Design a binder for this molecule. Sequence first.
Ligand code: NAD
Ligand code: NAD
Ligand code: NAD
Ligand code: NAD
Lengths: 260, 260, 260, 260
Amino acid sequence: TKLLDGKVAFITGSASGIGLEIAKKFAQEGAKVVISDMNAEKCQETANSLKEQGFDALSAPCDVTDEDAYKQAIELTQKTFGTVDILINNAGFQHVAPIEEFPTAVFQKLVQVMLTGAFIGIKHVLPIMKAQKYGRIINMASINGLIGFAGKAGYNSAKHGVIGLTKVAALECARDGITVNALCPGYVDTPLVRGQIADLAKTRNVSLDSALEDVILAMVPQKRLLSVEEIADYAIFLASSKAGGVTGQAVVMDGGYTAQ
Amino acid sequence: TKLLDGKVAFITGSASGIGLEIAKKFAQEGAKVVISDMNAEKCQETANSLKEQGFDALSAPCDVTDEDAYKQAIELTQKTFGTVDILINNAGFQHVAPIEEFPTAVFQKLVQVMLTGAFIGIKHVLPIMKAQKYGRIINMASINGLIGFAGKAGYNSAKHGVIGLTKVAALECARDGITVNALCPGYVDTPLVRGQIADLAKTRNVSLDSALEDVILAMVPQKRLLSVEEIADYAIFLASSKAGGVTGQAVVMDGGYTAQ
Amino acid sequence: TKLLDGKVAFITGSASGIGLEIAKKFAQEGAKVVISDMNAEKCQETANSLKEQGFDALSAPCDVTDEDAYKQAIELTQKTFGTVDILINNAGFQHVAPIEEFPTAVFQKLVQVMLTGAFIGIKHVLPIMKAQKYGRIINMASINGLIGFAGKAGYNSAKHGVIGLTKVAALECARDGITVNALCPGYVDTPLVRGQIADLAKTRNVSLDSALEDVILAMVPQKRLLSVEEIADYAIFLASSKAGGVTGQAVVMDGGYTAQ
Amino acid sequence: TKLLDGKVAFITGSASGIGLEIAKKFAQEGAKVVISDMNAEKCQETANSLKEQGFDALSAPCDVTDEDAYKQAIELTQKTFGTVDILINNAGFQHVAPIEEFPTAVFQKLVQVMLTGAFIGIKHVLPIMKAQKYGRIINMASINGLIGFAGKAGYNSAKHGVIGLTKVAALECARDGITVNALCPGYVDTPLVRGQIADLAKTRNVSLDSALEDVILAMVPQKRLLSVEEIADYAIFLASSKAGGVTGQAVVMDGGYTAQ
Ligand SMILES: NC(=O)c1ccc[n+]([C@@H]2O[C@H](COP(=O)([O-])OP(=O)(O)OC[C@H]3O[C@@H](n4cnc5c(N)ncnc54)[C@H](O)[C@@H]3O)[C@@H](O)[C@H]2O)c1
Ligand SMILES: NC(=O)c1ccc[n+]([C@@H]2O[C@H](COP(=O)([O-])OP(=O)(O)OC[C@H]3O[C@@H](n4cnc5c(N)ncnc54)[C@H](O)[C@@H]3O)[C@@H](O)[C@H]2O)c1
Ligand SMILES: NC(=O)c1ccc[n+]([C@@H]2O[C@H](COP(=O)([O-])OP(=O)(O)OC[C@H]3O[C@@H](n4cnc5c(N)ncnc54)[C@H](O)[C@@H]3O)[C@@H](O)[C@H]2O)c1
Ligand SMILES: NC(=O)c1ccc[n+]([C@@H]2O[C@H](COP(=O)([O-])OP(=O)(O)OC[C@H]3O[C@@H](n4cnc5c(N)ncnc54)[C@H](O)[C@@H]3O)[C@@H](O)[C@H]2O)c1
């Protein structure tokens, strides 16, 4: 069966990692998918490969902090596919430092990409969704939106913020056939994380295996990275017509991290 | 596709309402389902109808407060189907009173059915699941496990308690291929609730429609009862092989109740 | 100054540990204190020493699971001091086991002492407090009321439950000048805990110091036991006329345990 | 007794409302208080009146979004009083609009004042506090940091964010004698709120009394505004040497709003 059959899905940061898998898996479920990221070359390359596999894919690159460019990617989507049924605000990045050595500019940029970016997306899709009395907004948050972690002042601040935006947005459209949720993964096996494992391995003079098993997974009860496939599967449920009563939630898939 | 293909699902309180729909929908997803409740007559009638529709159904009635009878229903399941892959602790009931007029016996019985009952189920399935390094335990909790509501001393106490049991159980089996989650519905269109709408309509001398729209749905942003179909659909996801990284969570489907 | 000047404080489990310090410190703040516990000999000894220090102390021993004896301790308080302004539900105990080896009787008893006990206390003081349009109820919960911990099925279930009872009770008396809060300590330097340090030291063949510093404080950011003095100081604030707008809260003092 | 005796308290937004009361009440508890706000004239006027009442008060005006001016107010404090023991990040404002009509600039400014402002304060006091192995940081958040409210996209996003910053900061200094908490008031009787009552009274053609009792207090179980005195009293406890084991918490004083 095709759980997202001829729905139109716009996914920010979809040229790598969780967003790329979400785009791929949404297409397999019958979605028309919009590949959007900074790297406009990976975006065409991505959408072009999905088209060769017989999928409906549009390249609509944009910096989510650039409201003019984000608004025009949304208009190109409307022009191309007729609507936006599903928005995934996934674009993000990381900077780990103690607060004293945390550049204020970088704090502000993490917040601008991962909070203000989601707010821009939502502001511009809410009209399209309210008109059709249907939609699904998923803000890719993190357990770091629900707990503290030393060195992640900007990230945890931005992810905490996007859960607040999620609840406010959910209340504003609860009557309009529209859900607004924050999907909160724990550690996922992504380019992002294998880099951070490499990072920790160099600096602590340990093997990639120890770096992963003794540091990163130290506080994960299941002692494993989640697969992008697992995040994508939860995204499909939340993005589907079957999840219309789920709204204003921080939805957690963290191998038990936050249960302790 | 059949998301629960030849999994064995044991569901407490499955002769009516959410448990009956879960049993029906789990069967459509290829589960072998065990109908278990107080009313042993409805249990045979239920399982007999599922068998006539070409489903694999066992009647294993028991009072979940009766640990001998619960343990024997689990053994009859093992004998019949070879294992238990999925436990749904769904059995429950309600008594609304101000604390001063809340009989202590009734407080204790709500807790015994809806907390101690879940603990008995889990204690007896954990061996079977740990041996096979696979399982799914879903404790049917409520938003009343996450918030207060005047008049529900025993219910809210028991539902809060089963979320605590959920987290403890999740941590004890996180390495064993086993997930333990609490599904937290808001108001569902059930025999239970249509009765409580009738109740409120008599006592306040209003129509069933006002009783529903002005009292019960007063604090539901979506202003609607959830369908048993919606709870069942979330239960299928959480009970499926696709949700192996979801554990120790209060998973909320409440039309936005708890977002405000 | 005397923050509890001629208030009447009834404290369950007040013959040792946190309850004994609360009784002592409440007396220093001008409270009339009721010492209540299982050990009726320690209760007279306690109250007799407070009297010799020029304090107003009553011995009213009772098992909090014995509703007849709890109701009569409350009546003896009314007879002796004229009212109950402050109830501290502190009585408790611990049994750590994996769920499979967790006797159901012991699960039920942890819940009966630490949930049903608090409900009995509240049921019997709510009339006295509602009549006078004043009161303070503090349920001694734990971080284990807010998170999971492996081996604590009964404890975490009971503490989770008493936070639910707290919210329900708070909503029932929010107009009556009455607050209902759950004080949630982390690890406190108590007879209870020094025993559990001794326990862990024997079984793991390590020093008391390693047992404390490497096991118990492993997940405490501040890397220290809290003093009974610290819990008592928060109890005084919450029990004082200054905290009338604090109600229905899990109030956490855990050296940062739950922030991660 | 003087609970803050010769502690040095720097309070942002302290020329009106909660910050002004905190400054006044901290002075009565023996603090040396720094009055800091946009209005540099109210700041001198404030500090000058505290000096005439025999208090230790410094006027150090600054825009908390201006990191150069905030850093220099902190240096003037060090020069004047020798240290900073207590930081209250209180500066804030409100803009209520549906997301579609919510100017992105205004979203960004609410976040810059109430999140980035707190991060600037913390970055610059953490060195002073870590050197002396003592401090207290209180971020004035709101229940709107813990729940959703329609029309408050920027506010709820910023307040949610500052709770995240609170937990991260708490973990970074848990060993250094420093606590970081977010005080979360409900509706307080402030210039801010009496304005919003006037606002609602005009627009809905109702009396100030109905506007307050039927709209604002609709979801407050205690059906009353909190006094600035009540927030100040909790701030004193959290800012005192008695609260050293409280850290990384959203500390709620909301007349029961969030318990339902
Ligand atoms: N990987 C994990 O373990 C993990 C855990 C929790 C949550 N998350 C969150 O999930 C999301 C996906 O992360 P990921 O691990 O797939 O990797 P990633 O962050 O490398 O991928 C995100 C994509 O966002 C793009 N991007 C960055 N800034 C952008 C901007 N301003 N505008 C447009 N695109 C921009 C990047 O180019 C990248 O391709 C992020 O929001 C992340 O914070 C990740
Ligand atoms: N209906 C709602 O709106 C709602 C909302 C939140 C959560 N819930 C929870 O979901 C579950 C299902 O409730 P429901 O609305 O389908 O109706 P229900 O409570 O009428 O059905 C539950 C079943 O449990 C059975 N049962 C009761 N005590 C039992 C015992 N000791 N042993 C065995 N079986 C027993 C009953 O006979 C009944 O058939 C309950 O746990 C309820 O608390 C319901
Ligand atoms: N010590 C800690 O680190 C810690 C941490 C979190 C919360 N708590 C909670 O704080 C409370 C105080 O614990 P504590 O460490 O002071 O020690 P404790 O549990 O040894 O003291 C509690 C007292 O309760 C009494 N008691 C037990 N069962 C009773 C019953 N049925 N009726 C009456 N009295 C009974 C005991 O005799 C004892 O004197 C408990 O509720 C505990 O669960 C303790
Ligand atoms: N009043 C309530 O009911 C309530 C409820 C929850 C939380 N809060 C929070 O408590 C705090 C105090 O609010 P309040 O009601 O006393 O009123 P307020 O917001 O009017 O007072 C805050 C002060 O901050 C100052 N300020 C604003 N922007 C500034 C900037 N960039 N730099 C420096 N100073 C600046 C203002 O001039 C003002 O004097 C705020 O953070 C508010 O969000 C208030």
